[PDB]
Amino acid sequence: TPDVFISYRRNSGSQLASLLKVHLQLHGFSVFIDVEKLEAGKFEDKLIQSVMGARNFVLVLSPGALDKCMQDHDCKDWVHKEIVTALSCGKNIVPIIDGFEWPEPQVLPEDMQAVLTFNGIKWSAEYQEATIEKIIRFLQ
């Protein structure tokens, strides 16, 4: 099982998620992201077990990363599923803010509003090494 599971909105956060993976692996962490380490089997089971096994849950809040989570009361969006699974397993949630504007907590489904109560790390394009070191300090 890995140390860091990176959740992200594909279209807007895939690149930064890969960047976080490369840096965290340079600092000795094992990072799971679907684009690389997702292997054979049902992707639902494998995604859920990877979230459940990872000690840390890094959430890449890219611009509009939670737009498809809103009013998703059937819990069908995968970032929504991953956030709910991380919350359920009492995971160490470390949100990464990258030009993200926090919506009202009450507009998001009740089973994930708690993600807004976690201290996040603002992504700095000018001081990426400092952001990575702060993320390391958040990781366990």
Side-chain angles (χ1 to χ4, degrees):
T1 57
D3 311 327
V4 177
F5 179 93
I6 293 186
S7 183
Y8 65 99
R9 186 62 58 181
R10 183 84 47 82
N11 55 34
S12 58
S14 50
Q15 309 280 23
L16 179 54
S18 292
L19 185 56
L20 289 185
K21 175 180 182 298
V22 178
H23 278 279
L24 295 176
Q25 287 190 323
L26 283 184
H27 284 79
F29 286 83
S30 56
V31 184
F32 181 95
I33 192 177
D34 49 12
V35 299
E36 178 162 338
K37 284 209 159 55
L38 193 63
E39 297 201 283
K42 304 202 175 295
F43 60 86
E44 189 167 58
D45 307 357
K46 297 306 183 189
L47 281 174
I48 295 302
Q49 79 154 347
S50 305
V51 179
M52 288 185 166
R55 179 64 207 103
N56 311 274
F57 178 79
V58 167
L59 182 61
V60 189
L61 297 177
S62 54
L66 308 175
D67 293 343
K68 291 182 167 299
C69 299
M70 295 169 190
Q71 300 174 349
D72 181 66
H73 289 318
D74 296 302
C75 204
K76 289 169 63 181
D77 190 68
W78 269 114
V79 174
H80 184 191
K81 277 185 154 72
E82 293 165 355
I83 294 174
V84 173
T85 307
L87 289 171
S88 293
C89 306
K91 295 302 186 189
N92 178 38
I93 296 190
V94 186
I96 312 300
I97 304 166
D98 172 51
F100 177 86
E101 273 199 16
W102 298 70
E104 302 281 11
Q106 60 269 14
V107 313
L108 296 164
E110 184 178 333
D111 60 0
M112 62 167 285
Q113 296 178 0
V115 74
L116 263 55
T117 67
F118 283 92
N119 188 36
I121 292 173
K122 304 188 178 182
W123 174 257
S124 190
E126 284 78 0
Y127 315 103
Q128 295 185 18
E129 67 288 346
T131 64
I132 295 304
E133 290 167 8
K134 192 183 190 183
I135 295 172
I136 295 301
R137 286 197 305 277
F138 279 44
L139 294 181
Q140 53 179 252

